[PDB]
Ligand binder design. Sequence first.
Ligand SMILES: O=c1[nH]c(=O)c2[nH+]cn([C@@H]3O[C@H](COP(=O)(O)O)[C@@H](O)[C@H]3O)c2[nH]1
Ligand SMILES: O=c1[nH]c(=O)c2[nH+]cn([C@@H]3O[C@H](COP(=O)(O)O)[C@@H](O)[C@H]3O)c2[nH]1
Ligand SMILES: O=c1[nH]c(=O)c2[nH+]cn([C@@H]3O[C@H](COP(=O)(O)O)[C@@H](O)[C@H]3O)c2[nH]1
Ligand SMILES: O=c1[nH]c(=O)c2[nH+]cn([C@@H]3O[C@H](COP(=O)(O)O)[C@@H](O)[C@H]3O)c2[nH]1
Lengths: 358, 358, 358, 358
Amino acid sequence: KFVEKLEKAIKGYTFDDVLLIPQATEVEPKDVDVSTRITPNVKLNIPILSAAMDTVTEWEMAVAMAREGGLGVIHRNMGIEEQVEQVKRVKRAEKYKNAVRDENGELLVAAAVSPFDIKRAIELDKAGVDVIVVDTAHAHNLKAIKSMKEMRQKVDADFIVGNIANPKAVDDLTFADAVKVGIGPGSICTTRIVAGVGVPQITAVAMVADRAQEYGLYVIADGGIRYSGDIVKAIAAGADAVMLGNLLAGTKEAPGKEVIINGRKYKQYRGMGSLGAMMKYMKTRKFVPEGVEGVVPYRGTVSEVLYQLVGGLKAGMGYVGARNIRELKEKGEFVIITHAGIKESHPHDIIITNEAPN
Amino acid sequence: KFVEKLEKAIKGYTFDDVLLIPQATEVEPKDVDVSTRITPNVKLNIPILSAAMDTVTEWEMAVAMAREGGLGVIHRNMGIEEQVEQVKRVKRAEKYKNAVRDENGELLVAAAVSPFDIKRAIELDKAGVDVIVVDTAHAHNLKAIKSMKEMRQKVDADFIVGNIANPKAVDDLTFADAVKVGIGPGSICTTRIVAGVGVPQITAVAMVADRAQEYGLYVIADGGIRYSGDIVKAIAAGADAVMLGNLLAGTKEAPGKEVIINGRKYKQYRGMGSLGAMMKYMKTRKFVPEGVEGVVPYRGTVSEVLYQLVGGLKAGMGYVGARNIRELKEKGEFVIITHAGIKESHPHDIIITNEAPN
Amino acid sequence: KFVEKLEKAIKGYTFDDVLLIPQATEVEPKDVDVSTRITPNVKLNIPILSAAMDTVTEWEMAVAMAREGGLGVIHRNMGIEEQVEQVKRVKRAEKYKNAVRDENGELLVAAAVSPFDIKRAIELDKAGVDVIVVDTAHAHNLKAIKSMKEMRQKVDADFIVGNIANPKAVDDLTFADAVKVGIGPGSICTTRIVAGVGVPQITAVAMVADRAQEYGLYVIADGGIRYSGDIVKAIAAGADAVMLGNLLAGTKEAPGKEVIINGRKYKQYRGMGSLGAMMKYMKTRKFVPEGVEGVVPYRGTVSEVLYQLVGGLKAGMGYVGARNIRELKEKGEFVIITHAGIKESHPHDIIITNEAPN
Amino acid sequence: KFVEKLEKAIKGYTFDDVLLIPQATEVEPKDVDVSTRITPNVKLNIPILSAAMDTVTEWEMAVAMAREGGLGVIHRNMGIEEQVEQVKRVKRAEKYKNAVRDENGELLVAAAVSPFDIKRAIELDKAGVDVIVVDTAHAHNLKAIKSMKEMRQKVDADFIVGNIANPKAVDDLTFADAVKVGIGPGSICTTRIVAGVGVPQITAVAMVADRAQEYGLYVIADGGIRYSGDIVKAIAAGADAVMLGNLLAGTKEAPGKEVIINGRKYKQYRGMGSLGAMMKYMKTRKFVPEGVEGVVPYRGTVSEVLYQLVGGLKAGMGYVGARNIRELKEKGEFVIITHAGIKESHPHDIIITNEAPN
Ligand SMILES: O=c1[nH]c(=O)c2[nH+]cn([C@@H]3O[C@H](COP(=O)(O)O)[C@@H](O)[C@H]3O)c2[nH]1
Ligand SMILES: O=c1[nH]c(=O)c2[nH+]cn([C@@H]3O[C@H](COP(=O)(O)O)[C@@H](O)[C@H]3O)c2[nH]1
Ligand SMILES: O=c1[nH]c(=O)c2[nH+]cn([C@@H]3O[C@H](COP(=O)(O)O)[C@@H](O)[C@H]3O)c2[nH]1
Ligand SMILES: O=c1[nH]c(=O)c2[nH+]cn([C@@H]3O[C@H](COP(=O)(O)O)[C@@H](O)[C@H]3O)c2[nH]1
């Protein structure tokens, strides 16, 4: 019985365990289309959402994301009235040819809510939020799901529930428009260390994506993205879009506090499940933290970060012969590599003097 | 023949090689029950025992452990009369709703003895010890086992023999109430380096647990636990409880000497098979040490450490839908991960400023 | 579908994942012949080409390479007239018994061109270049290949197209004399990090070599070579020759700028896809860099570096009983090793005071 | 063809990839017998030989080794007359109950020779050397083997040829008494880096041992031993004895020059295939070095080192229920472990203050 648990254990892979195999390419890469659909009513011009964290997304980030064709999810570590005001400021913010707007030409915006905060949801919905993101650590909670269903029935906005890491969870969330995948891969996440629970992101996305495709739900890969190359892999693994925390934290638009150390600029970045975040409107029913607090170097503007990420994604799509997202998901093939392969993949046997992305 | 040894070699896994897969959860996590049975007459309120080491468990630790629902095993690197006095002080120590007590309302306590120290055992038994723990490096020793049987017949207390790492050893220990698993995983253990013998803990627990279940014996996972997440994995692998050395060392109650270095507080922690421990009542028939001496940072009180560990265990059980220990052992499923997966599981690509567990 | 991508994923190996198994040897090693054919009209006396990079190969490097029996590929990050002049200076440069010369006794030389630069190619061809090397990041580009075919028809020089990492690409390049293998292994390469695309070099060379052999095309392993041992492995994996960047950079003949740091000598080495290289005649249609800038320690003269590399290759060939290149490719057998095996393969448990290669 | 080389590649294991599984033990460990036979006329009281290196074995080391029941192999980086004198001094050196002596009560001694130095061999034989050790990097050399056969016919001493790493080599060396296994694992060895050739030691010993057993030849595992635990594994893998360089270097008896750095004592240790060793009577037909030069910390006397090593071996044998060497080779079973398992096997999550072996 216990030995069979080990013998039958599935083998899980993360971003660094795989590489995409180059293929014949007819069109690339400057002509690559990266638009993608995440909900019945929402198609982004770039497959990127900014995390719903208090050191990542507030109104400024959301405006910047929407102007670039992406989407910002206003965090919920604030009062309901404060969150509705953030949403309104974004919707009325409008040179940005890639911007994603609603029927009235207003920038799109999303906002996070707890599975039980139906009041908050309705207020956000009335404020004109385009997407409601049920933001929980383990969405496959029955009681929570019952509350989610009631919530879905009382709002018009599109509905995204996350996070999950087991395909079986999709079967009980078919009332949502999309599911967010990611349990334990976050840069500031300690859930796997504290709880011992999780699934390597590439494997998690693939398992969930196959099940989601069966029900008509979209998939968002959340957490663990460190390089543009990870985005290409996530999409090839089945995701329609990715959600970034670390890579967007430290940008001018990020609400994280500035920090200088040794003359170098940084910005705070912390898990919403950290003491600091808890010491700020959520009160989780958790006895111990599952996130840490840290800092990331100053990255410049959101615009500059997205240009690099999207640039890399387009290069990767060109290399595999994918003219659009659907084709990447369709024909992207993987090769599994070893630790030594990981080392050779990064720059090696050299004293780097400049790694600039321009 | 020799090549077949390699071809037929079993693949062994340790804590970091696996993760638990999230599942549908109906009740969690603050309502999770972590009580567990380790012997016919002993059920703990938390699945944790403090190691029988001279830098970990003496009367103060044992009192603190029992008051929290756990169990302390008084070490045997002292005289018989000194050990009986430690036991008595614990039994008469009694605001602690989770405390584990015997029929007379006295805190429970355990004590270690050598497989050959029948005299010590009888004295401990008369002093009212609740559990006698035969404490040896390799319990699957025939001569030792013969002595153990005679010992079991002369004491009333429950009987725990360890340590072992091969299921075949259980077959010859069916006269005991439970077996302790762990050969080589300890934080200060060098047995695998000095002797070249051992079995990765997750695999060892699983193999032994399947065999133990066939005979009605309980299983305790001893050594190698560094995080609360490891506890969840050990139990899911077949263990009824775990034994901690490193994580309890450095607490206020631990008998280890205090040490200050660079203004920072530490406490000594060393293997019982180290020169220091040997230079203190045991005299092993070993030519060379199989343990080292070191220090661990000050952790605070036992109460604070247990709260965190149990907190993590409850979070993990909630994530897999386990309302109690039996269900964790019953339905916990694993996913095997690579080194890259291990890296992504811990916090990464961030300059940590705070990892506090509150 | 997505899960099958992972289940059917091929396992890729790089240089450090393998070792060659020693065999009975009748002749070795000072009598080992390392000559090798890379094109219908070109056989080198040593299986080594210098990279077409602006910090590696200009006329001096090319002269040194040809004098030792190797081949230099003049980089294309300069004007057409400048490149033709570099070529002419090499052809007229002529104590060097291993030198490779053309029919008129002139040192051989190669030059790189973009798949679309037919003008540059014709000029190089008229200048007497022996080999034209189509130098692109992803040669399996249809539009590029159409241009390549027109180019092949307008020049007399031998034709080498690269780089590729998929055997399927060979099928569409049968009009060339040889293909260059290598996508992502370079010491200063970030293509796998930025685009997420690539194939571990040993696996890439083997897959391509089997397909190339079917069409009569030669194979050159480009990138990732750090030690002479890697050369032996690359050839045993199917390559006819290797191309070096890092190992030749830092030599007296390399055009890289000199840099002193802490009294120690270095020379600049950077990817052609780096800002620095771009800031120098190419203008790629890439949005972001896929190479970095760094420095390598001063290595001495090209002659000294080649002696060591070739020395190692000959030792390795002797150990496997290969009197020539054809036999190495023919009978070289591999054993796959683990990370621990990699550690034991390098010097260990010692404080090195001298690693000199004389 | 090339892809099949990878698909059919055998998987090789080194010491750190495996652990021995504990078993029922009837007698251990102070009653463990570690005597072992390495040749028809030579049985050692401990399975250890000192390397034939100029920084490891000269007459003092050989005397110390024989007095402890082991064997010293006088290195050949000296003149013939100097080597014969070293041998004589050992034979006439004679409180040492474990000493290994010949028929006349003289300490045993071995000496190394090149496969072609028949003159040196005969002189050593006449001087009374007990074992002649043909000392070469790749013994599976036909020309060398022909010379070896002539040598075997002109000496009375027992004959040991090494090193090899392929079982096929044993088939051509059946005229010898034993073969020495080890190509590339040495602490100061770079053969695998320079030549790309080698076989992980555990796998090499096992493959060779199975073939050797078929012909009646003994096996000596040479190189890569860092801990007593490695000795237990090597023997369990099929070896009759092991040869140590690094672990014996740095002892009082070792001829290596003393070196002080930061108040700490060290002794030089270098490969015989290093410039330093070459700059000292061998003149190899190698173009480049395959060994490095370094230093090891002062270890104390040979006696103290052997006590620890043998102590560990006995502990390991007790843990697996082996009362003697034959039984270890007979019933020792392995479990393969991962990198994480390797980490847990060593001391972890502790600040070591003392690792003393007493
Ligand atoms: O287990 C967790 N404990 C936390 O405290 C925490 N905070 C954020 N997150 C999630 O991490 C995602 C961002 O991941 P990255 O920084 O790698 O982009 C985000 O999308 C969040 O989903 C957490 N997960
Ligand atoms: O091989 C060993 N040599 C030793 O000297 C030694 N000292 C303690 N122990 C065992 O390690 C366990 C505690 O392990 P942790 O520190 O990882 O919690 C404890 O439960 C002890 O079983 C030893 N094992
Ligand atoms: O992806 C890349 N981005 C770059 O900027 C770049 N620059 C050079 N190269 C290629 O790397 C090869 C040299 O590799 P080594 O330094 O390891 O010898 C060379 O042969 C080049 O093919 C690049 N690849
Ligand atoms: O490839 C090699 N190049 C060298 O220069 C060299 N020097 C010593 N040896 C061999 O290494 C063995 C000692 O290995 P350890 O230091 O790990 O005990 C010894 O037994 C020697 O066989 C060499 N191998």
